[PDB]
């Protein structure tokens, strides 16, 4: 069921300090090697008025 | 995105063991300057694709702080403690933003990880550490590329004299 | 539900001044046993009808605590400090559950209130207190009746020797 | 100033609520309907859990939100 | 200096009941900008003279904050929640400095009060509130005059529809 | 009950304080002398810094201890 | 006892550089169940002997908790983040007690380290990690033998793709 | 001024939950290797009514 390289995709919906946003993302990683990379796109509420960094551990 | 972790020293992998059912996680991050970032996430496996659904509520970020001024810089690496509580996993960690200029803004992460398997079905890991490095590889307010590397381990660097992990 | 407050001593009413546009609020409540309850709310006015839309994320509540055991008792009354920051209002307060055994479990509320009017169209109140008493008057796990009384005031009980509010 | 006397103030105002949330993994939705007295500072409402009921946690954690 | 409280509504007075032996208290105050102020105190009675012995450790105050800059303004009044735990009293409260620029800096007090009488010789008060107003009436960095008024009460401003205190 | 009337209560009580501490590395010692009205809930004191003065921090952080 | 640290990757040693003047440290540790432990420490060098003078104030430990029941077990290893703030070093870390039975009680350490040299005299380290393992080697309530190993490092385990430490 | 092996000594004085105590200790370590060990003796207020563990990072 897992594989040495796997893709993933994300949807994120949120409010931060009253500002609504939505993102989608797509990435891929090596689960057993512990590395991954993705692209995150803000599809609603962009450009974000807050630092993306607060979303890093969620995306 | 906890499926992507290199575990050493035989530590059981709570996340990989959770498939094909998957798992959730929930977290509140408390920033030292008053901000809070709370999230709930569902992780599922749809064929060959990991699927993440995330809900976010952030609040109380000061208008004059790095977050709302969009001058947050970059995250330093960090280390999470991960351990069993009741029958699920708790995590806690400290993270630090290195603001442009070189100064740091810290926060505290409080997490629960919940397998969708019964913990009777799971090999639970003992107390251990999860090192991470998150990097914003490209700011392509609207399009970001982000990298993470993570390692699950014991404290190899300072060994026990008493037989402990 | 901050439209329903009795303000004394001429304290300006941020909430009532914000209509017809309304206001939002956001909060994280931190419980002393590890739980967090986060909310975002929108308050609007449609004709004569006040409309509340609420988003909630709660996490890290201990499985054996009074919240997840549904043995929480009743809230004590409490008092919030309310004051302006960066042209919005901050609130903070301590609340306490009186469990059926008579012991108490406390929590700390961290709130921001955001008018939909610009601060320039508002008379901001100075630092003051908002007393509340919330009572779950009946559980008619699916139907609840809740009452609240709230008062906005200065500290009259212990007056200043200098004329401060 | 300006409203003259309490006879000119709205005595009661109704409100309605929608609540959607997740607590410790448990999703739920509620509706509510209430009324209050804006200047006397009192109010009461009924909250109905329409999805995720019976709630598996104390309603109390929702008291300041509803 | 908890011997000087006006208690209303028949609330038992833990502090006055503790004489002639006296009582101790201990507290950590956490400031929102990182400072901590910890104290231990002993209260004794020698004849007619109340004797206070205080130990203090403060740390982590930011160099550019109002405390280390000695630009703290004045305290606002506040309200403490006071309640029994394990046969002693716990207190918690939020306080706020009103800096000369008009902004506020908050802190959270976490206290335990310990009679030198056994709990069996005491009438313990139920959960209640202690209002305070502290005023630095004069700085005569070496000589200060400070006043305090304190009231112990239930929540009369927002009464119960059920007869609870 | 028992004291009859306020005429039988002590109206004022004196107090003295000694404070020793370190704040951000800075050692100090204070003495104080005050008086209060136990049942009216009011009090006032004078605090003198006898070592480590003039204090290099706001006295305010000592207010709830002194 | 921060003189005893193996630093790698050329990280400057704030503590060893402080001699012969020495340094102080100050800390508040916040326990998840309400306890607080605050300490101030002076480190000097008297000939060939390091001399430590420590002052401690602990409070609010629950009577029913592991600390006051003297059923605390052993500390897990941990990792401190250490970074410059104003011109001194801040540290923060999470520690966890493994109680007898295998369950954990966590706490949060908040530290400032102060050289007695002017920081103009010092080579300040950038943000880094200090791993520790503290072990009670022998309980010989009155006589203890305690071991510690500590390492100061960057995040080697999860390297940067961007040139960062 | 430092050396590959160094001794140290400690005095600790404190109050925890209203209980006064004093300790002394003596130990030795290798500062550059990052290892150390000591013995801590409670000289006043013993036997401690609280877990010694809360003193570990101070002694």
CATH of residue F15's domain is 3.30.1300.40
Q: Which subunits count as partners of chain B given 3+ CB pairs below 8 Å?
A: A, C, D, G
| G138 chain-B contacts, CB cut-off 8 A | none
Give E58's contacts (C-beta < 8 A, 6+ positions apart): E35, E36, E37, E38, F21, F22, F23, F24, F57, F61
Q: Is residue F1 part of a domain?
A: no
Give B152's contacts (C-beta < 8 A, 6+ positions apart): A34, B5, B6, B7, B8, B11, B13, B82, B125, B128, B129, B130
Contact F40, E3 (CB under 8 A): no
Contact G137, G146 (CB under 8 A): yes
Q: Is residue E159 part of a domain?
A: no
Q: Is residue B159 part of a domain?
A: no
Class of residue G33 by CB neighbours under 10 A (exposed 0-12, middle 13-18, buried 19+): middle
- The Cα–Cα gap between B12 and B152 comes to 9
Q: Per the CB < 8 Å rule, is D64 touching C137?
A: no
Beta pairing, strands B49-59 & A6-16: parallel
Range of the domain at A43: 6-51
For residue G14, list its beta bridge partners. Answer: none
Contact B96, B121 (CB under 8 A): no
Contact C95, C134 (CB under 8 A): no
> Nearest 5 degrees, angle CA C152-CA C154-CA C158?
135
Instruction: Return the number of other C-beta atoms located less than 10 Å from residue B46's C-beta.
Output: 10
Widest Cα–Cα separation across chain C: 52
> Nearest 5 degrees, angle CA F7-CA F9-CA F10?
115
- The Cα–Cα gap between G42 and E141 comes to 25
Q: How many separate domains does chain G show? A: 1
Token digits of residue B57 = 């509520």
H helix intervals, chain C = 14-17, 66-69
The experimental method is X-ray
For residue B128, list its beta bridge partners. Answer: B82
Contact F58, F49 (CB under 8 A): no
| G129 chain-B contacts, CB cut-off 8 A | 77, 79
DSSP strands (E only) in chain E: 6-7, 23-31, 36-46, 49-59, 74-75, 78-85, 88-98, 104-115, 128-138, 143-153
Q: Is residue B163 part of a domain?
A: no
- The Cα–Cα gap between A24 and A9 comes to 7
Chain D residues with CB under 8 Å of a chain C CB are 13-24, 32, 34, 36-49, 53-66
Q: Is residue E164 part of a domain?
A: no
Q: Per the CB < 8 Å rule, is C52 touching D17?
A: yes
Resolution in angstrom units:
1.4
Instruction: Return the number of other C-beta atoms located less than 10 Å from residue B41's C-beta.
Output: 23
- The Cα–Cα gap between C45 and D13 comes to 10
DSSP per-residue codes, B63-114: TTSTTTTT---EEPPEEEEEEEETTEEEEEEEEEEE-TTS-EEEEEEEEEEE
For residue C111, list its beta bridge partners. Answer: C27, C91
Q: Is residue E65 part of a domain?
A: yes
- Residue identified by tokens 């004059």 is B64
Comparing alpha-carbon positions, the chain A residue that sits nearest to C39 is: A15
| A12 chain-B contacts, CB cut-off 8 A | 54-56
Ramachandran region of residue B9, left (φ > 0), alpha (ψ -120 to 50) or beta? left
CA B52 to chain centre: 14
Contact A40, B144 (CB under 8 A): yes
Contact G62, G34 (CB under 8 A): yes
Selection from B5, B6, B9, B7 nearest residue B165 by Cα: B9
Q: Per the CB < 8 Å rule, is C34 touching B110?
A: yes
Give C47's contacts (C-beta < 8 A, 6+ positions apart): none
Q: Is G30 near chain E, with CB under 8 Å?
A: yes
Instruction: Return the number of other C-beta atoms located less than 10 Å from residue A45's C-beta.
Output: 18
DSSP per-residue codes, chain G: -TT--EE-TT---TTGGGTTT-EEEEEEEEETTS-EEEEEEEEEEETTEEEEEEEEEEE---TTSTTTTT---EEPPEEEEEEEETTEEEEEEEEEEE-TTS-EEEEEEEEEEEESS-GGGS----SEEEEEEEEEEEE---EEEEEEEEEEE---SS--SSS--
Q: Is E26 near chain H, with CB under 8 Å?
A: yes
Which of G60, G62, G88, G119 would you mutate first to test chain E, the one with the most E CBs within 10 A?
G60
Contact E82, E91 (CB under 8 A): yes
Contact C41, C57 (CB under 8 A): no
Contact B123, B133 (CB under 8 A): no
For residue B41, list its beta bridge partners. Answer: B25, B54
- The Cα–Cα gap between D59 and C58 comes to 12
- The Cα–Cα gap between B54 and B42 comes to 7
- The Cα–Cα gap between C27 and D64 comes to 10
Q: Is residue F60 part of a domain?
A: no
- The Cα–Cα gap between G140 and E47 comes to 45
- The Cα–Cα gap between B108 and G71 comes to 27
Indicate the residue of B78, B135, B159 with minimum beta-carbon distance to G162.
Answer: B135
Comparing alpha-carbon positions, the chain B residue that sits nearest to C89 is: B60
Sign of the dihedral defined by the CA atoms of residues B95, A14, C92, D57, in that order: negative
Contact C101, E126 (CB under 8 A): no
Give G10's contacts (C-beta < 8 A, 6+ positions apart): none
How far does chain G reach from its first CA to its final CA, in angstroms? Answer: 26
Q: How many separate domains does chain D show? A: 1
| A32 chain-B contacts, CB cut-off 8 A | 6
| E24 chain-H contacts, CB cut-off 8 A | 18
Q: Is residue F49 part of a domain?
A: yes
Indicate the residue of D14, D47, D65 with minimum beta-carbon distance to C41.
Answer: D65
Q: Is residue D12 part of a domain?
A: yes
- The Cα–Cα gap between F35 and F44 comes to 6
Rounded to 5 degrees, φ, ψ at C69 are -80, -10
Sign of the dihedral defined by the CA atoms of residues C66, C70, C71, C72, in that order: positive
Number of residue pairs across F and G with CB atoms under 8 Å? 9
Q: Per the CB < 8 Å rule, is C55 touching A15?
A: yes
Instruction: Return the number of other C-beta atoms located less than 10 Å from residue G161's C-beta.
Output: 12
- The Cα–Cα gap between C52 and B143 comes to 33
Contact B152, B165 (CB under 8 A): no
Q: In Å, how far is C3's CA from the nearest CA of chain D? A: 6
Q: Is residue D64 part of a domain?
A: no
Q: DSSP character for C155? A: -
Helix H or strand E encompassing E119: none
Q: Which subunits count as partners of chain A given 3+ CB pairs below 8 Å?
A: B, C
Q: Per the CB < 8 Å rule, is C38 touching B28?
A: yes
Q: Is residue D3 part of a domain?
A: no
Give G163's contacts (C-beta < 8 A, 6+ positions apart): none
User: Could you give the count of Cα atoms lying within 13 Å of D2 in the half-sphere of its Cβ?
Assistant: 0
| A15 chain-C contacts, CB cut-off 8 A | 26, 40, 55
Q: Per the CB < 8 Å rule, is B129 touching G79?
A: yes
- The Cα–Cα gap between E56 and F64 comes to 11
- The Cα–Cα gap between D8 and G9 comes to 76
For residue C56, list its beta bridge partners. Answer: C39, D21
Helix H or strand E encompassing E20: none
Give C101's contacts (C-beta < 8 A, 6+ positions apart): none
Q: Is residue G163 part of a domain?
A: no
Touch between D and C (at least 3 CB pairs under 8 Å): yes
Q: In Å, how far is C136's CA from the nearest CA of chain B? A: 26
DSSP strands (E only) in chain C: 6-7, 23-31, 36-46, 49-59, 74-75, 78-85, 88-98, 104-115, 128-138, 143-153
Range of the domain at E120: 6-153
- Residue identified by tokens 């308050």 is C43
Rounded to 5 degrees, φ, ψ at E20 are -80, -5
Give C103's contacts (C-beta < 8 A, 6+ positions apart): E85
Using alpha carbons, list the distances in angstroms from residue A57 to B41, B132, B133: 11, 10, 11
Helix (H, G, I), strand (E, B) or coil at C15: helix
Sign of the dihedral defined by the CA atoms of residues E77, E83, E89, E91, in that order: negative
**Structural gaps in chain G: residues followed by a C–N separation over 2.5 Å:** 140
Helix (H, G, I), strand (E, B) or coil at E114: strand
We report the CATH number of the domain holding residue G86 as 2.40.155.10
Q: In Å, how far is B113's CA from the nearest CA of chain G? A: 16
Class of residue F10 by CB neighbours under 10 A (exposed 0-12, middle 13-18, buried 19+): exposed
- The Cα–Cα gap between E152 and E158 comes to 16
**Cis peptide leading into residue F54 (ω within 30°):** yes
Token digits of residue D59 = 């309603």
- The Cα–Cα gap between B65 and B73 comes to 12
Contact F35, F15 (CB under 8 A): yes
Q: Is residue H57 part of a domain?
A: no
- The Cα–Cα gap between C11 and G132 comes to 54
Q: Is G145 near chain B, with CB under 8 Å?
A: no
Q: Is residue G133 part of a domain?
A: yes
Contact B16, B6 (CB under 8 A): no
Using alpha carbons, list the distances in angstroms from residue G17 to G111, G116, G126, G149, H5: 19, 10, 15, 20, 17
Touch between E and F (at least 3 CB pairs under 8 Å): yes
| F22 chain-G contacts, CB cut-off 8 A | 26, 40, 55
- The Cα–Cα gap between C130 and G132 comes to 46
| A1 chain-B contacts, CB cut-off 8 A | 19-20, 45
Q: Per the CB < 8 Å rule, is A48 touching B147?
A: no
Sign of the dihedral defined by the CA atoms of residues C134, C138, C139, C143, in that order: negative
- The Cα–Cα gap between C80 and E127 comes to 17
> Nearest 5 degrees, angle CA E136-CA E140-CA E145?
35
Contact H54, G67 (CB under 8 A): yes
Which of F16, F57, F62 would you mutate first to test chain E, the one with the most E CBs within 10 A?
F57
CA E28 to chain centre: 11
Contact E83, E43 (CB under 8 A): no
């Amino acid at each position: 069921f897992l594989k040495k390289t796997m893709p993933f995709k994300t949807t994120i919906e949120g409010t931060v300090n009253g500002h609504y946003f939505k993102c989608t993302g797509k990435g891929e990683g090596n689960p057993f090697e512990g590395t991954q990379e993705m692209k995150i796109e803000v599809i609603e509420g962009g450009p974000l008025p807050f630092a993306f960094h607060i979303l890093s551990t969620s995306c | 995105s906890k499926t992507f972790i290199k575990y050493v020293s035989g530590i059981p992998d709570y996340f990989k063991q959770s498939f094909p059912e998957g798992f959730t996680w929930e977290r509140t991050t408390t920033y030292e300057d008053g901000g809070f970032l709370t999230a709930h996430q569902d992780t599922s496996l749809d064929g060959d694709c990991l699927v993440y659904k995330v809900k976010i509520l952030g609040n109380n970020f000061p208008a004059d702080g790095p977050v709302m001024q969009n001058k947050a810089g970059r995250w330093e690496p960090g280390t999470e403690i991960v351990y069993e509580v009741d029958g699920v996993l708790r995590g806690q960690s400290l993270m630090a933003l290195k603001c442009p200029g070189g100064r740091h803004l810290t926060c505290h992460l409080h997490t629960t990880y919940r397998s969708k398997k019964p913990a009777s079905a799971l090999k639970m890991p003992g107390f251990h550490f999860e090192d991470h490095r998150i990097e914003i590889m490209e700011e392509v307010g609207k399009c970001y590329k982000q990298y993470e590397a993570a390692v699950g381990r014991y404290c190899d660097a300072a060994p026990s004299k008493l037989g402990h992990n």
